[PDB]
């Protein structure tokens, strides 16, 4: 047992194992220890997969890299391609044309919306929503709840909810529960009334049908989803309005994109955000404000979406680092600085010459070393209880100037709030969303549901599993609003006569410097993404990825500091230590992508 970052870690209590962690991307094992009152007093995050993309890339052409690294992950599909082309362009001093910038931003914001909304409904919702309780709901009361939660959502009739309920009833009465089989239904950890559960299940089905429309934006610009195509120097989707039906992008295609964006705006505003505000209100009322972990102290993002291309002071999700819960001081984050972003492997299944130091990714090393500690229960190929005192994960340990940080939408929203309070005008919208959300959660929704009004500040509400879930929904909404503006800027630029989509001046490697290094960063759906590349004689010399779930899911560092997942689980009571409802609820609030984390 030891203390770190204000957490008193203690492994003497009852050990609980969750393997597999489900409703995530990829493979994770989680172990906790609980005290005599079922409160988590130790948590262990184990990434249970590795593929070795960084190793595979060595010797290949930098122009091909985006497609390899895109296949790090099909959920956050394209964000790695974006990081890669940015890294190569940075190495080779390539400036992309305005239309390519705007198209990439539209693609990025489409991914944010799709990823966030699908995560919440299809992966996260079942930690908050009891589907069996939905069967007991009254359709008229569900209709009335829907009208209170979101007046503008037109799918609100009692008959509609009754039809959805009857279909769920028939499914369940078949005896083949499928994805609902052996669930934790009826646990006291679930607090929603039946009507709220039926509303949420209805929206789960609505989101499942609608999500396939949103990604058609990727299909137009990138050919396919998942895994749209990218290009070093711009985009491949050449523009021709008249000369034209044969060009990748004409006015009809752009009109189609705008129709899809408009639908997204409606979904975020009428379905997703109101649902999260409502569910968050009801769990707040139950007192479930656990899960803050590192969000209460240390948050980081690289900053993204500049109002003016290549001008970072105009980032609409402005970044930096906050330490020790001091929201009055945002430190600048420089991905080029060797003393800032570093990765340790002290408790990871890799080898460095000296594991007491962290490597900046331009000097990163990925040599596997699968070995289990002396206190392991089980064998090398049959683990019963992992030994977190030794190496226990395929995830490296990223730190910022040695500090353990949380990344993600919550981090970006805390940073945006801090920036806005310091006078940054580019952060006004996320600040407004937060203030609106706090008022809804504290007063308006409680007043509408006949519950007591509360007075939580953003300082109190945001660093919590509820807050983390809320920030994701708000970010989805903001991203939809931003790409709506980007579309207008794109069409205006094309109509003014600039149709350029690629800079090919340095396409041929005979034009390249004989060596170069570059970095590309992205505000990916789950947080701060970076790719660092070294090029030599036209080939990849080194390629290192530090990915958002690498930060959040990281195991302990050389100093024994815990990462965001482990910190978030600490000090949480479990209704039943053998039903991982609370573990799943909090882990899922980070939207863990394990293929991303390990690559």
């Amino acid at each position: 047992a030891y203390a770190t970052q204000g957490f008193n870690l203690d492994d003497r209590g009852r050990r609980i194992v969750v393997d597999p962690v489900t409703r995530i991307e990829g493979h994770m094992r989680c172990e906790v220890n609980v005290d005599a009152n079922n409160v988590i007093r130790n948590a262990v995050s184990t990434g249970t997969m590795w593929r070795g993309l960084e190793v595979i890339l060595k010797g290949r052409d930098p122009r091909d890299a985006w497609a390899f690294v895109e296949r790090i992950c099909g959920v956050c599909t394209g964000c790695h391609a974006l990081a890669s082309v940015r890294a190569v362009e940075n190495a080779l001093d390539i400036r992309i044309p305005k239309n390519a910038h705007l198209i990439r931003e539209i693609m990025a914001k489409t991914l944010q919306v799709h990823d966030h909304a699908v995560h919440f409904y299809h992966l996260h919702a079942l930690d908050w929503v009891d589907v069996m309780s939905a069967l007991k709901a009254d359709p008229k009361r569900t209709s009335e709840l829907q009208q209170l939660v979101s007046p503008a959502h037109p799918l609100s009739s009692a008959g509609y909810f009754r039809d959805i309920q009857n279909r769920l009833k028939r499914f369940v009465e078949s005896g083949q529960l499928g994805p609902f089989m052996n669930g934790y239904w009826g646990s006291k950890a679930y607090v929603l009334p039946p009507e709220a559960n039926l509303m949420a299940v209805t929206h789960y089905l609505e989101a499942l049908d609608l999500q396939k429309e949103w990604v058609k934006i990727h299909t137009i610009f990138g050919g396919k989803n998942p895994h749209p195509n990218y290009l070093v120097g711009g985009v491949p989707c050449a523009i021709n309005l008249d000369g034209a039906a044969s060009a990748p992008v004409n006015m009809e295609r752009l009109s189609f994109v705008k129709a899809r964006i408009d639908e997204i705006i409606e979904f975020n505003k009428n379905v997703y955000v109101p649902d999260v505000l409502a569910i968050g209100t009801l769990y707040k009322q139950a007192g479930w404000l656990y899960g803050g972990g590192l969000a209460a102290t240390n948050v980081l993002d690289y900053g993204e979406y500049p109002n003016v291309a290549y001008n970072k002071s105009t980032d609409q999700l402005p970044g930096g680092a906050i330490l020790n819960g001091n929201w009055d001081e945002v430190f600048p984050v420089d991905p080029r600085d060797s003393q800032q972003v570093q990765e340790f492997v002290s408790h990871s299944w890799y080898k460095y010459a000296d594991e007491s130091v962290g490597l900046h990714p331009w000097d990163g090393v990925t040599e596997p070393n699968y070995v289990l500690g002396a206190n392991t229960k089980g064998t090398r190929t049959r683990i019963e209880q992992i030994d977190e005192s030794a190496k226990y994960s395929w995830i490296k340990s990223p730190r910022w100037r040695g500090h353990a940080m949380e990344v993600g939408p919550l981090s970006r929203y805390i940073l945006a709030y801090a920036h806005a309070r310091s006078g940054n005008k580019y952060a006004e919208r996320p600040k407004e969303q937060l203030e609106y959300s706090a008022q809804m959660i504290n007063s308006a929704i409680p007043k509408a549901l006949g519950l007591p009004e509360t007075q939580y500040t953003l300082k109190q509400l945001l660093p919590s599993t509820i807050g983390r879930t809320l920030a994701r929904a708000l970010e989805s909404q903001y991203c939809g609003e931003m790409m709506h503006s980007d579309w207008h800027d794109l069409v205006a630029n094309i109509r003014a006569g600039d149709t350029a989509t690629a800079n090919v001046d340095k396409w041929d490697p005979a034009t390249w410097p004989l060596q170069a290094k570059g970095v590309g960063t992205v505000a990916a759906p789950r947080g701060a993404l970076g790719h660092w590349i070294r090029i030599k004689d036209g080939r990849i010399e080194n390629y290192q990825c530090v990915v958002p779930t690498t930060w959040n899911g990281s195991p302990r560092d050389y100093k024994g500091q815990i990462g965001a997942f482990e910190a978030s689980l600490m000090n949480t009571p479990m209704v039943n230590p053998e039903q991982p409802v609370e573990i799943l609820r909090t882990l899922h609030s980070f939207d863990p992508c394990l293929a991303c984390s390990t690559h």
């Binding site: 597999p20 590795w50 396939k212 990604v215 058609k216 990138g222 396919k224 290009l231 989707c237 060009a247």
Partner: protein, 269 residues
């Protein structure tokens, strides 16, 4: 009663699972609620840990020789198999256990079919396709990174309607979706036939939709439904949106040279 599907995940990126839920005809919602019983799937299932693993036992017993095993991703043979761990054990052990009583095995995507990106040189985990590990069961390969959504649901729909695997080619792919090369019906083919090619990105030729062969298009050597069925309810495909096919449904496509290097012997095609 709906046929149980046990959908396992090895080393993967999850693109095939995501592609599956893009299906418009049929809707994935209707597949899950009314066509199959999706009883195990790490991506979507409510149960975790011990409760999740208990499902495999139950379904294999009750539906012995009458469930479908779908596999996304692949097993690693290096690191003693523990570069992919499930329930504290190598994934390959789960794969072999569930495969033994399956009536049919679907290898979803290039990972399960052939190896895909993790099997590209130097293959640090010795990632191995399903058919090299499971050698005594009927397998259908549905390659592509990911496969087209309607190809995935088209395969499931066939298997459920007929209780049969559709006719396969020599490589184990369904002829109903993989009989044509992209180049056969690619809408840019008249340009190829007239020697009309893009030579640099965003040149005049690119703005007129000229053929992408000289920019590295692997359509002439790649079998898939992308030129006809197309992607995301027939919205586009890679070539329509201006990038050459990179060959993503073909075995070993990551190690066939740069995606931007053209095929040699253009007269072959």
């Amino acid at each position: 009663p709906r046929t149980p599907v046990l959908w396992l995940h090895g080393l993967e990126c999850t693109c095939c699972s995501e592609s599956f839920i893009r299906s418009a005809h049929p809707l994935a919602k209707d597949v899950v609620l009314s066509m199959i019983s999706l009883d195990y799937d790490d991506t979507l299932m409510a149960a975790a840990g011990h409760q999740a693993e208990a499902i495999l036992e139950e379904i294999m017993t009750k539906y012995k020789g009458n469930y479908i095993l779908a596999v996304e991703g692949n097993p690693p043979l290096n690191q003693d198999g523990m570069s992919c761990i499930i329930g504290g054990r190598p994934f390959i052990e789960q794969l072999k256990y569930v495969a033994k009583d399956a009536k049919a095995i679907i290898s979803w995507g290039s990972c399960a079919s052939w190896g895909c990106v993790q099997a590209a040189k130097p293959n640090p985990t010795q990632a191995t396709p399903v058919h090299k590990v499971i050698t005594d069961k009927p397998i259908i390969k549905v390659p592509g990174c990911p496969p087209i959504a309607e190809v995935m649901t088209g395969v499931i729909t066939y298997m459920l309607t007929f209780d049969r695997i559709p006719e396969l080619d020599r490589q184990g792919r369904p002829k109903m979706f993989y009989s044509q090369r992209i180049h056969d019906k690619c809408y840019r083919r008249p340009h190829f036939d007239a020697g009309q090619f893009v030579e640099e990105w965003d040149d005049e030729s690119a703005r007129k939709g000229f053929c992408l062969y000289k920019m590295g298009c692997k359509g002439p050597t790649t079998y898939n439904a992308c030129s006809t069925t197309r992607w995301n309810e027939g919205t586009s495909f890679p070539i329509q949106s201006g990038h050459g096919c990179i060959g993503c449904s073909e075995d070993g496509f990551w190690d066939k040279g740069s995606f931007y290097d053209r095929l040699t012997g253009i007269s072959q095609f």
